[PDB]
Amino acid sequence: TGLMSLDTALNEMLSRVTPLTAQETLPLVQCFGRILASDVVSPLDVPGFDNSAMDGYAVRLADIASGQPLPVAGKSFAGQPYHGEWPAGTCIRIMTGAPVPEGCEAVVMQEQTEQMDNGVRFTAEVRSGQNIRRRGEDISAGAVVFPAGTRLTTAELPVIASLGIAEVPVIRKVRVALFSTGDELQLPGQPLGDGQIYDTNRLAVHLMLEQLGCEVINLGIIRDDPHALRAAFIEADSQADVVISSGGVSVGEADYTKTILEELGEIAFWKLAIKPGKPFAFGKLSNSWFCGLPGNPVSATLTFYQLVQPLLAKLSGNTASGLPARQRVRTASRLKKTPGRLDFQRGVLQRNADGELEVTTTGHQGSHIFSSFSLGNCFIVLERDRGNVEVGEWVEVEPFNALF
Amino acid sequence: GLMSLDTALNEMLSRVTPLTAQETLPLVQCFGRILASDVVSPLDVPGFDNSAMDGYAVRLADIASGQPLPVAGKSFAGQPYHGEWPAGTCIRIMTGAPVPEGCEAVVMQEQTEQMDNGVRFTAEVRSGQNIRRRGEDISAGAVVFPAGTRLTTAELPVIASLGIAEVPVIRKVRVALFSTGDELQLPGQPLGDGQIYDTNRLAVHLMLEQLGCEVINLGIIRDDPHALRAAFIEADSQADVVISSGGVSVGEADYTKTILEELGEIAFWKLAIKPGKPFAFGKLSNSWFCGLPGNPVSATLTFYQLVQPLLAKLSGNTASGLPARQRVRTASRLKKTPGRLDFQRGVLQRNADGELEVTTTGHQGSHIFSSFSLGNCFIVLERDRGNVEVGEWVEVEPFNALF
Ligand SMILES: [Mg+2]
Ligand SMILES: [Mg+2]
């Protein structure tokens, strides 16, 4: 038969879901990474009043024109503005941020002035408005500052705080149930029975889920018993928006698990044109969506990263999405490649004698090892119908995000 | 004159010692923590020779006979075969199940045809095909991760494959924080004459937590010398680092500078950078001090390029201490003055041609904080360079996850 393209599989998945709308209001310090549920519209002008941008003296243009020294009637600070008398022929010592006096027309740097006996003289011309930041020049009251669907980071939260807003409404955390199946799987700190190995995928998915801002319900390991498995699915579906199998449940093979899966929902089993991996299951349970990952650790991790991650992004209500961008760079390592599959190989991005990045391999790309995720810092995304690439050619690279 | 940024950082780093106090935590609670000791594998991974496919385990001599081989038994995942395996027969096996005693090869189901008197093999069989060997991944005894390794999704699951549930990591860095000034007001409160909302304190708090530090926020302190002294004593009493987000002298001779000079040994630098320049650093009775300038743009840049690396060393992280940069061509004409290393904000994107190029976010004035939302990278302009035209190369430093 034939293999399904990755963007095809992805677009197909995304067209089926609806982004959550349930919200909750939280103080700013608790919002890193949360999604805005509604537009943030400013109740005030920013800045709130005409203020000084420099340390210096505030004056009236008609006073400069005299050519004669102007005595300091007073001084104005941001913490305590001046409100005394400001008679004609005089100036005011003003600091950064302090509001401008009654009829001030400009602010002069402390550097472009000379102290006289009983007054201050200014050297260099003075233009109306110099060193004066005006009310509303940055933000207008009634204007939309950040649109709904915006992921909040250090770049926008402090801005929201300059508005005087202490709490904001955000979409609730996406709830994800997760578990693994297999008589060969053992828990941490327990002895290994005949033919057993330690469960690793579940911890990997748990960690990524938490760093992505989701709320995780980890149900542990379920042994190969038809009664226990059905009960696990029903419990997981009951309390979450998404249910994920980190390994053990069929992604195509006709075994006892595939039967239970199909009785509980409408599932699709795909054969993707990727490497490593290939099979992937996705479908609708009674009260949630289902994602089933392949058993191989390398394949499970790559599959979660490129399909489940963006799936969760749309569900959270985030409008900006597509994952990290890619760039073309030359390779310094011979790479082995076979046509027919988009091969996400691991490598190492680095600087060249000149200053531009170049990528090396991490070693073998088998799925019999996991260490390449640690050594490398990026994905070398080799085109579906391409073959082996030699030193010097161009390749596309995708730097790892913060999960690695 | 001025002090280069390399000079300031080096000075700072040479003065401090990384933390060594440790605590043990389960794996699921270790994201971003620093491994305190070498992790040594007590097992072989895999722990046994097993099949890589769903199919059949056989002997080379049986295949050579050319006759079909009936099934003598089966091996399941976690249910291996320990029964009889007579000459002229084969054993059924699944992915990940261990190979029976004496197995020489594994054949996938598709290179097979079910006959009436046994299973027939249709392809050539090479010795060792489709058998994963014990230890091919991790040998018992080896050191898997050295002390100093920052733990992420890349290493924690590997540790789990060893059967280890918890590991020892360095304690979190404790950082106290506060701002000062009669003009600062708290969120959800009315602004009096000349007041503005405190913005710097939140910025720092946010970055500190994302970097894995334990934050101790003391709030806003009014211009009162008695309250200032109390804030310093309190902060210094339970912290590794103390930070003033704004309001305390970075060089100017006011009442706050006097207090600073009274409680510790501080230095007031004037850096050759833009935006900003002033920065305060020194030693208090039980901690290190970092004083940021008042302008929001200056404080954030200053914290990012100087305070961030200092906290990295303190944490015990042994990873590189080199900002990741690269040279690209600019697509905007940049205005630059000789004499200051200018950390302008810009936008990196693919040209229709496929390679990266950067454009400005717009006006690089410090009176605004928006360049951080619009941009996704810094444009690090050499200290002595002048204006630059379209087509010239420049150094760019992509933003990390704090932005
Ligand atoms: Mg199984
Ligand atoms: Mg002040």
From chain A, the residues in CB contact with B165 under 8 A are 188-189
Measured between alpha carbons, how far is B110 from B113 in angstroms, rounded to an integer?
A: 8
Structure tokens, B397: 């430093």
Residues 364-393 of A with CB under 8 A from B: 368-371, 373-374
SS3 B403: coil
For residues B57 and B2, membership in a common domain is answered with: no
Q: Is B31 at the interface with chain A, CB within 8 A?
A: yes
User: Which of A79, A188, A404 is nearest residue B163 as measured by Cβ atoms?
Assistant: A188
Burial grade of A304 (CB within 10 A; 0-12, 13-18, 19 or more): buried
In this structure, is residue B121 part of a structural domain?
Answer: yes
In this structure, is residue A402 part of a structural domain?
Answer: no
Q: How many domains does chain A have?
A: 4
Q: Is A322 at the interface with chain B, CB within 8 A?
A: no
* Residue B359, CA distances (Å) to A81, A328, B331, B351, B381 in order: 40, 18, 5, 11, 14
In this structure, is residue A333 part of a structural domain?
Answer: yes
In this structure, is residue A307 part of a structural domain?
Answer: yes
B195 CA → ligand 2 middle, Å: 11
Q: What share of chain B is helix, strand, coil (3-state, %, to 5)?
A: 20, 30, 45
Contact A19, A310 (CB under 8 A): no
Measured between alpha carbons, how far is B250 from B292 in angstroms, rounded to an integer?
A: 7
Measured between alpha carbons, how far is A331 from B171 in angstroms, rounded to an integer?
A: 40
Burial grade of A29 (CB within 10 A; 0-12, 13-18, 19 or more): middle
Q: Which residue of A has its CA nearest to B201?
A: A158
Q: How many helices (H) and strands (E) does chain A have?
A: 9, 26
Measured between alpha carbons, how far is B130 from A275 in angstroms, rounded to an integer?
A: 18
Query: At residue B281, what are phi and psi to the nearest 5 degrees?
Result: -150, 140
Nearest listed ligand to the Cα of residue B179: 2
Structure tokens, B44: 């072989």
For residues B342 and B377, membership in a common domain is answered with: yes
Q: Which of B150, B156, B221, B146 is nearest to B186 (CA)?
A: B221
Q: What is the CATH number of the domain that holds B292?
A: 3.40.980.10
Measured between alpha carbons, how far is A50 from A137 in angstroms, rounded to an integer?
A: 10
Measured between alpha carbons, how far is A29 from B273 in angstroms, rounded to an integer?
A: 30
Name residue A13's beta-bridge partners: none
For residues B56 and B104, membership in a common domain is answered with: yes
Best interface-test mutation with A: which of B95, B197, B250, B399 has the largest number of A CBs within 10 A? B197
Tell me which of A147, A171, A195 is where a domain ends.
A171
Contact B328, B358 (CB under 8 A): yes
For residues B187 and B222, membership in a common domain is answered with: yes
For residues A127 and A61, membership in a common domain is answered with: yes
In this structure, is residue B61 part of a structural domain?
Answer: yes
Q: What is the CATH number of the domain that holds B344?
A: 2.40.340.10
- What's the farthest any 2 CA atoms get from each other in chain B? 100
Measured between alpha carbons, how far is B89 from B82 in angstroms, rounded to an integer?
A: 15
Q: Which residue of A has its CA nearest to B160?
A: A200
Measured between alpha carbons, how far is B173 from B32 in angstroms, rounded to an integer?
A: 12
Name residue A106's beta-bridge partners: A59
Dihedral (Cα; A297, A299, A305, A307), 10-degree rounding: -140
Q: Which residues surround ligand 2, an ion (CB under 5 A)?
A: B 181, 247
Measured between alpha carbons, how far is A341 from A386 in angstroms, rounded to an integer?
A: 9
Q: Which residue of B has its CA nearest to A81?
A: B194
Q: Is B192 at the interface with chain A, CB within 8 A?
A: no
Burial grade of A38 (CB within 10 A; 0-12, 13-18, 19 or more): middle
Measured between alpha carbons, how far is B269 from A288 in angstroms, rounded to an integer?
A: 58
Residue B247 host element (H or E): none
For residues B243 and B362, membership in a common domain is answered with: no
Contact A9, A270 (CB under 8 A): yes
Q: Is A328 at the interface with chain B, CB within 8 A?
A: yes
Give residue B376's domain range. 324-396
Q: Tokens 């040279």 — which residue?
A: B327
Total residue length of chain B: 403
Burial grade of B306 (CB within 10 A; 0-12, 13-18, 19 or more): buried
Contact A180, A246 (CB under 8 A): yes
Q: Tokens 């935006």 — which residue?
A: B275
A53 CA → ligand 2 middle, Å: 15
Tell me which of B118, B137, B156 is where a domain ends.
B137
* Cross-chain Cβ contact A194/B80 below 8 Å: yes
Burial grade of B5 (CB within 10 A; 0-12, 13-18, 19 or more): middle
For residues A294 and A184, membership in a common domain is answered with: yes
Give A342's contacts (C-beta < 8 A, 6+ positions apart).
A5, A6, A273, A274, A275, A381, A382, A383, A384
In this structure, is residue B401 part of a structural domain?
Answer: no
Structure tokens, A72: 């300091």
SS3 A197: strand
For residues A275 and A264, membership in a common domain is answered with: yes
Contact A156, B202 (CB under 8 A): no
Measured between alpha carbons, how far is B332 from B317 in angstroms, rounded to an integer?
A: 38
Query: At residue B28, what are phi and psi to the nearest 5 degrees?
Result: -60, -15
Measured between alpha carbons, how far is B198 from A29 in angstroms, rounded to an integer?
A: 13
Determination technique for this PDB entry? X-ray
Structure tokens, B363: 């006006």
Q: Is B255 at the interface with chain A, CB within 8 A?
A: no
For residues A244 and A282, membership in a common domain is answered with: yes
- Centre a 10 Å sphere on the Cβ of residue B124 and count the other Cβ atoms it contains: 8
Interchain CB contacts (distance < 8 Å): A and B: 203
For residues B34 and B78, membership in a common domain is answered with: no
Q: Is B319 at the interface with chain A, CB within 8 A?
A: no
Tell me which of B323, B340, B371 is where a domain ends.
B323
Question: Buried b vs exposed e over B211-245: b needs ≥16 C-beta within 10 Å?
Answer: bbbebbbbebbebeeeebeebbeebbeebbbbbbb
Q: What is the CATH number of the domain that holds B67?
A: 2.170.190.11
Measured between alpha carbons, how far is B218 from B204 in angstroms, rounded to an integer?
A: 13
Structure tokens, B268: 């007031």
In this structure, is residue B402 part of a structural domain?
Answer: no
Residues 210-249 of A with CB under 8 A from B: 210-211, 224
DSSP letters, B332-388, are SPBP--TTSEEEEEEEEEE-TTSSEEEEE-S---SS--THHHH-SEEEEE-TT---B
For residues B180 and B246, membership in a common domain is answered with: yes
For residues A68 and A122, membership in a common domain is answered with: yes
Structure tokens, A70: 């102007």
In this structure, is residue A316 part of a structural domain?
Answer: yes
Q: What is the CATH number of the domain that holds A167?
A: 3.90.105.10
CB pairs under 8 A, 24+ apart, for B133-136?
B133/B46, B133/B49, B134/B44, B134/B46, B134/B47, B134/B48, B134/B49, B135/B44, B135/B45, B135/B46, B136/A368, B136/B46
Measured between alpha carbons, how far is A54 from B193 in angstroms, rounded to an integer?
A: 19
- Centre a 10 Å sphere on the Cβ of residue B190 and count the other Cβ atoms it contains: 7
* Residue B390, CA distances (Å) to A62, B328, B329, B335, B395 in order: 44, 11, 8, 11, 14
Q: Which residue of A has its CA nearest to B54?
A: A253
A181 CA → ligand 1 middle, Å: 7
